[PDB]
Ligand binder design. Sequence first.
Ligand SMILES: NC(=O)C1=CN([C@@H]2O[C@H](COP(=O)(O)OP(=O)(O)OC[C@H]3O[C@@H](n4cnc5c(N)ncnc54)[C@H](OP(=O)(O)O)[C@@H]3O)[C@@H](O)[C@H]2O)C=CC1
Ligand SMILES: Nc1nc(N)c2ccccc2n1
Ligand SMILES: [Ca+2]
Ligand SMILES: [Ca+2]
Ligand SMILES: [Ca+2]
Ligand SMILES: [Ca+2]
Ligand SMILES: [Ca+2]
Ligand SMILES: [Ca+2]
Ligand SMILES: [Ca+2]
Length: 159
Amino acid sequence: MISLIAALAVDRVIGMENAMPWNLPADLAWFKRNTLDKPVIMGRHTWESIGRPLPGRKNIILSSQPGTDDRVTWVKSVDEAIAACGDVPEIMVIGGGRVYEQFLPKAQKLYLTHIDAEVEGDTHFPDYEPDDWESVFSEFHDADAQNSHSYCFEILERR
Ligand SMILES: NC(=O)C1=CN([C@@H]2O[C@H](COP(=O)(O)OP(=O)(O)OC[C@H]3O[C@@H](n4cnc5c(N)ncnc54)[C@H](OP(=O)(O)O)[C@@H]3O)[C@@H](O)[C@H]2O)C=CC1
Ligand SMILES: Nc1nc(N)c2ccccc2n1
Ligand SMILES: [Ca+2]
Ligand SMILES: [Ca+2]
Ligand SMILES: [Ca+2]
Ligand SMILES: [Ca+2]
Ligand SMILES: [Ca+2]
Ligand SMILES: [Ca+2]
Ligand SMILES: [Ca+2]
């Protein structure tokens, strides 16, 4: 079972110059909650954006070229990435834009943080068909002293 987890600002913007331009500790806690003890698949740009291995998770990196870090697992295709996870209940695809586009047809669940932020970006979440997904979890939060935007955590399941 493949799931995508992503944080989306206005117009499905997810990144700008290898960074997520917002500071939402509540999204970091949600991300950790939902990915811990699950293999994580990421694109090479995301691996460089994060900057280090994610603890308590098997880290699988997609690249057409050989790996440059043995602390993580390197793969050269979507099918090889899935295979490297082994027999696990759930695989988490953590980005970026290009990796989400490829795993979206195979995904059964979307863990989305809808951020109320105006972000000029260079990376977007794929334009998912609303008719194909059903909202099973939806928890809205107002901004506070730690989180500068209002945000909604949503879980969508493929109909
Ligand atoms: N808001 C959010 O939730 C998140 C946002 N982001 C943002 O997204 C951006 C990064 O996204 P993006 O630029 O799309 O890059 P990605 O992180 O999706 O990485 C793409 C790279 O991964 C490799 N790759 C992808 N698919 C394959 C494949 N099928 N086979 C082999 N290699 C593959 C390629 O590496 P190579 O070139 O080596 O072949 C490719 O250049 C950053 O701005 C980051 O901040 C990232 C995660 C989460
Ligand atoms: N919701 C969400 N999804 C991600 N894929 C992510 C990647 C790294 C750090 C914060 C993140 N938050
Ligand atoms: Ca900033
Ligand atoms: Ca490239
Ligand atoms: Ca060795
Ligand atoms: Ca881009
Ligand atoms: Ca439509
Ligand atoms: Ca803030
Ligand atoms: Ca159904």
